[PDB]
Design a protein around this ligand. Structure first.
Ligand SMILES: O=C(O)CNC(=O)C(=O)O
Ligand SMILES: [Mg+2]
Ligand code: NI
Ligand SMILES: [Zn+2]
Length: 331
């Protein structure tokens, strides 16, 4: 069995190996990469996502989100307070202000210490989930707006044609902006490219140990757990590495820098934070190996998780027994 300790693997494809996206994912899996829940892909030196980032300031962040925390430093939830619209140039100036900028630090480890000590005492503003793409249309390799669609994968594997679309999303971050513990919708893969700016630190639980994280989360968030049998689908709960280590939960960590891709694998729980002003692009995708995870994915039916149009068909076809209850949660 490849990668039996479930370590995060880092890949360096050549320009020839970067042509065929599906084939390279399957290669990484042949080496055991999925056992970690997360992999890093460093693009060949010849590749670029686009020519420059000099002309992105007029993109609109229609609904910036202020991430307000409650709890203790290592165990907290966050809620998202909507703010007035602002452009990317306006948000970058805000991120760089004295109130929001990254503090002085020695290295990534010192910054990580400061994040976990101090996050809860601040409310950073995140531009998340903005439909769109920064890949040049002429970039042919690993262009997250040109991937094979999940609907087409389900149709190729299972024979059933379904409605729905699959497009990418932009994320504009600042120091302390936070992504809560989650797996993807329908336990899909994700791919995330850090276009520019400061790093993103990730934490991940191997898929084979995901239920250990869920059982800890029910203990640490007991009211939330009574409210919903899949409350991590709400994407609001944070647990620090120190608390995970105290409770014996297997995990790994890695920092993504600008120019790098990360892939999350089906049922790989992940969480993390941004080091300073940055922009990432991410999308969900599927492979044949996903289908069995989609059929077994938990679902939130309490009403909180509210998701895209396209998840309807995935529930309806892969989980027909759950469909009626889940759709009630959507309405
Ligand atoms: O970058 C972020 O805020 C969150 N991204 C992801 O969870 C992802 O790419 O799967
Ligand atoms: Mg612009
Ligand atoms: Ni994710
Ligand atoms: Zn719920």
């Amino acid at each position: 069995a490849q990668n039996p300790n479930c370590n995060i693997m880092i890949f360096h494809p050549t320009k020839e190996e970067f042509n065929d996206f599906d084939k390279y994912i399957a290669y990484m899996e042949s080496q055991g990469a999925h056992r970690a829940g997360l992999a890093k892909i460093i693009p060949p030196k010849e590749w670029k996502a686009r020519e420059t980032y000099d002309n992105i300031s007029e993109i609109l962040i229609a609904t910036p989100l202020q991430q307000v925390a409650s709890g203790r430093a290592g165990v907290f939830t966050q809620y998202h307070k909507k703010k007035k619209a602002m452009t990317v140039g306006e948000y970058r100036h805000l991120a760089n202000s004295k109130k929001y900028q990254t503090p002085p630090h020695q290295n990534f480890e010192d910054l990580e210490r400061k994040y976990w000590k101090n996050r809860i005492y601040n409310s950073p503003i995140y531009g998340a989930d903005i439909s769109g793409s920064l890949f040049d249309e002429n970039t042919k390799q690993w262009n997250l707006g040109h991937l094979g669609t999940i609907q087409d994968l389900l149709e190729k594997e299972c024979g059933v044609v379904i409605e729905g679309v699959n497009t990418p999303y932009l994320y504009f971050g600042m120091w302390k902006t936070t992504f809560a513990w989650h797996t993807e919708d329908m336990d899909l893969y994700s791919i995330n490219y850090l276009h520019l700016g400061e790093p993103k630190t990730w934490y991940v639980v191997p898929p084979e140990h995901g239920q250990r994280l869920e059982r800890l989360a029910r203990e640490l968030f007991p009211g939330s757990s009574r409210g919903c049998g899949a409350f991590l689908r709400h994407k609001v709960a944070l647990i620090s590495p120190t608390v995970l280590k105290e409770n014996g939960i297997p995990f790994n960590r890695i920092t993504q820098e600008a120019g790098e891709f990360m892939v999350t694998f089906p049922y790989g729980y992940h969480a993390g934070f941004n080091h300073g002003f940055n922009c990432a692009e991410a999308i969900n995708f599927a492979t044949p190996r996903w289908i069995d995870y989609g059929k077994m994915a938990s679902q939130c039916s309490c009403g909180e998780a509210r998701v895209t149009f396209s998840m309807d068909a995935f529930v309806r076809i892969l989980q027909p027994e759950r469909y009626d209850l889940w759709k009630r949660g959507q309405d």
